[PDB]
Amino acid sequence: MTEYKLVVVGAGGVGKSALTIQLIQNHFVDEYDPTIEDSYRKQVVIDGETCLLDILDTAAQEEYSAMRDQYMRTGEGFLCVFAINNTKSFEDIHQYREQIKRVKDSDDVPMVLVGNKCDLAARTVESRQAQDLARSYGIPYIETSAKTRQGVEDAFYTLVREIRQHK
Ligand SMILES: Nc1nc2c(ncn2[C@@H]2O[C@H](COP(=O)(O)OP(=O)(O)NP(=O)(O)O)[C@@H](O)[C@H]2O)c(=O)[nH]1
Ligand SMILES: [Mg+2]
Ligand SMILES: [Mg+2]
Questions:
Q1: 120 alpha carbon, closest ligand
Q2: Phi/psi at 46 (5° precision)
Q3: What is the full DSSP assignment across 73-88?
Q4: Which of 43, 46, 114, 118 could form a disulfide with 143 if both were Cys (CB 3.0 to 4.6 A apart)?
Q5: Residue 15 Cβ contacting ligand 1 at under 6 Å
Q6: Any idea what the Cα angle at residue 124 is, between residues 128 and 11, rounded to 5°?
Q7: Is the Cβ–Cβ distance between 48 and 13 less than 8 Å?
Q8: Helix axis angle, 152-166 relative to 16-24, nearest 10°?
Q9: Is 119 close to ligand 1, i.e. is its CB under 6 Å away?
Q10: What is the CA(124)–ligand 3 centre distance, in A?
Q11: N-acetylmethionine (modified residue): where?
């Protein structure tokens, strides 16, 4: 069946790991501690088709990762995550996108912009601002909470559909 290589990127603390674990966790382990970069597998049916998702949870740009360029080459679609209470993380999206362009040599790489931590009242990035940004790149914008689980499935499955539509 169809395998998708997905990569989760973004600034430190935005919830890259929390999102990934929320999607892929089977709850055998009650609380799972993800301190390192790692890969995780999830089998899912999307629009009638059984997909195997291979999901790479990455470190922020400021962290050293030897395989960084290679996993961006491998990656077929990217969740570009910022937190709605962290303006710097939203501003850093430009840099994550540029890194993906640098490696893959394309302006048309499948991506979804994800405003995480939407359960929090203390918002500093308005949804309209992020919609405008996503529209300028021709990518979807999805808000999520890794805590309440709102939007998590939508974010990842939307990314899969972007990859499929890119073909
Ligand atoms: N309120 C709230 N907190 C969240 C949400 N997602 C993650 N967090 C919290 O934000 C902190 C960072 O989460 P984490 O999953 O480690 O983020 P990360 O982007 O993987 N961090 P790192 O870059 O260090 O790997 C944790 O305290 C986590 O519980 C969310 O949707 N809502
Ligand atoms: Mg993490
Ligand atoms: Mg406000």
A1: 1
A2: -120, 115
A3: HH-SEEEEEEETT-HH
A4: 118
A5: yes
A6: 95
A7: no
A8: 90
A9: yes
A10: 7
A11: 1
Resolution to 1 decimal place, in Å:
1.8
CATH 3.40.50.300 fits 1-167, yes or no: yes
Distance of CA 133 to the CA centre of its chain: 16
Q: Tell me how the structure was determined.
A: X-ray
| Residue bearing tokens 């395989």 | 67
CB 124 within 8 A of CB 87: yes
CA distance 99 to 86: 21
Residue 92 Cα to ligand 3 middle (Å): 21
Query: For residue 73, which phi and psi values (nearest 5 degrees)?
Result: -55, -45
The residue to which tokens 């914008």 are assigned: 141
Q: How far apart are CA 20 and CA 17, in angstroms?
A: 5
Residue 66, helix vs strand vs coil: coil
Each domain of the chain, given as residue ranges in start order, spans 1-167
- How many residues are recorded in the chain? 167
CB atoms within 10 A of CB 85: 18
